[PDB]
Amino acid sequence: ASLRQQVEALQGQVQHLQAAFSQYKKVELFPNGQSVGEKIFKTAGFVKPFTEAQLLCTQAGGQLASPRSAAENAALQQLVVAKNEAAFLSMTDSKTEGKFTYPTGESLVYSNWAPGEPNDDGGSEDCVEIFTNGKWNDRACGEKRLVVCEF
Amino acid sequence: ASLRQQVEALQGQVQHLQAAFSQYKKVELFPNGQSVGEKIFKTAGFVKPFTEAQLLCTQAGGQLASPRSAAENAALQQLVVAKNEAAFLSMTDSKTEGKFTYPTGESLVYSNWAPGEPNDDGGSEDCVEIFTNGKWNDRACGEKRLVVCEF
Amino acid sequence: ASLRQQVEALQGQVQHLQAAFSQYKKVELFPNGQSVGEKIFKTAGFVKPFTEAQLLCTQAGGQLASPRSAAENAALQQLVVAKNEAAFLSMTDSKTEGKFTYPTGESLVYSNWAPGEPNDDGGSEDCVEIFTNGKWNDRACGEKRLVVCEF
Ligand SMILES: CC(=O)N[C@H]1[C@@H](O)[C@H](O)[C@@H](CO)O[C@@H]1O
Ligand SMILES: CC(=O)N[C@H]1[C@@H](O)[C@H](O)[C@@H](CO)O[C@@H]1O
Ligand SMILES: CC(=O)N[C@H]1[C@@H](O)[C@H](O)[C@@H](CO)O[C@@H]1O
Ligand SMILES: [Ca+2]
Ligand SMILES: [Ca+2]
Ligand SMILES: [Ca+2]
Ligand SMILES: [Ca+2]
Ligand SMILES: [Ca+2]
Ligand SMILES: [Ca+2]
Ligand SMILES: [Ca+2]
Ligand SMILES: [Ca+2]
Ligand SMILES: [Ca+2]
How many Å apart are CA C129 and CA C146, to the nearest integer?
9
Experimentally, the structure was elucidated by X-ray
User: How crowded is residue A12: how many other Cβ atoms within 10 Å of its Cβ?
Assistant: 10
Ligand 2 site residues (CB inside 6 A) read B 116-117, 119, 121, 125, 137-139
Burial bucket for residue B104 (CB in 10 Å: 0-12, 13-18, 19+): exposed
3-state secondary structure chain B: CHHHHHHHHHHHHHHHHHHHHHHHHHHHHCCCEEEECCEEEEEEEEEEEHHHHHHHHHHCCCEECCCCCHHHHHHHHHHHHHHCCCEECCCECCCCCCCCECCCCCECCCCCECCCCCCCHHHCCCEEEECCCCCEEEECCCCEEEEEEEC
Contact C145, C47 (CB under 8 A): yes
Residues of A in contact with C23 (CB under 8 A): 40, 151
CA distances from B140 to A121, B47, B65, B134, C85 (A): 48, 14, 17, 18, 39
Nearest in space to C127 (alpha carbons), one of C145, C115, C140, C112? C140
H-type alpha helices, chain C: 2-29, 50-59, 70-83
Contact A135, A114 (CB under 8 A): yes
User: How crowded is residue B62: how many other Cβ atoms within 10 Å of its Cβ?
Assistant: 23
Contact C142, C50 (CB under 8 A): yes
Could you give the angle at the alpha carbon of C72 between the alpha carbons of C59 and C63, nearest 5°? 10
Cβ of C42 below 6 Å from ligand 3:
no
Q: How is A63-113 classified by DSSP, letter by letter?
A: EE----SHHHHHHHHHHHHHHT--EE-S-EEEEETTEEE-TTSPBPS---B
DSSP-derived 3-state class of residue C57: helix
User: C104: which residues sit within 8 A by CB, 6+ positions away?
Assistant: none
How far apart are the CA of A145 and the nearest CA of chain B, in angstroms?
A: 20
How many Å apart are CA B71 and CA B134, to the nearest integer?
11
How far apart are the CA of C117 and the nearest CA of chain B, in angstroms?
A: 31
User: Cα(A141) to centroid of ligand 4, in Å?
Assistant: 10
How many Å apart are CA C1 and CA C9, to the nearest integer?
13
Quick one: angle between helices A2-29 and B2-29, nearest 10? 20
Burial bucket for residue A110 (CB in 10 Å: 0-12, 13-18, 19+): exposed
Domains along chain A with CATH numbers: 1-151 (3.10.100.10)
Count of alpha carbons within 13 Å of A97, Cβ hemisphere only? 8
DSSP-derived 3-state class of residue C80: helix
Best of C27, C32, C40 to substitute, by most chain A Cβ atoms within 10 angstroms, is C27
Q: Could you tell me which residues are beta bridge partners of residue C129?
A: C88, C137
How many Å apart are CA C137 and CA C113, to the nearest integer?
6
Q: Do B31 and C60 touch (CB under 8 A)?
A: yes
Minimum Cα–Cα distance from C17: chain A residue: A18
Residue nearest to atom 8 of ligand 2 (CA): B121
Contact C109, C144 (CB under 8 A): no
CA distances from C10 to A117, B6, B126, C88, C131 (A): 51, 11, 49, 44, 48
User: A30: which residues sit within 8 A by CB, 6+ positions away?
Assistant: B42, B44, B56, B60, B62, B149, B151
Q: Chains that contact A by 3+ CB pairs under 8 Å?
A: B, C
How many Å apart are CA C48 and CA C145, to the nearest integer?
6
Count of alpha carbons within 13 Å of A54, Cβ hemisphere only? 13
How many Å apart are CA C93 and CA B51, to the nearest integer?
51
Quick one: angle between helices C2-29 and B2-29, nearest 10? 20
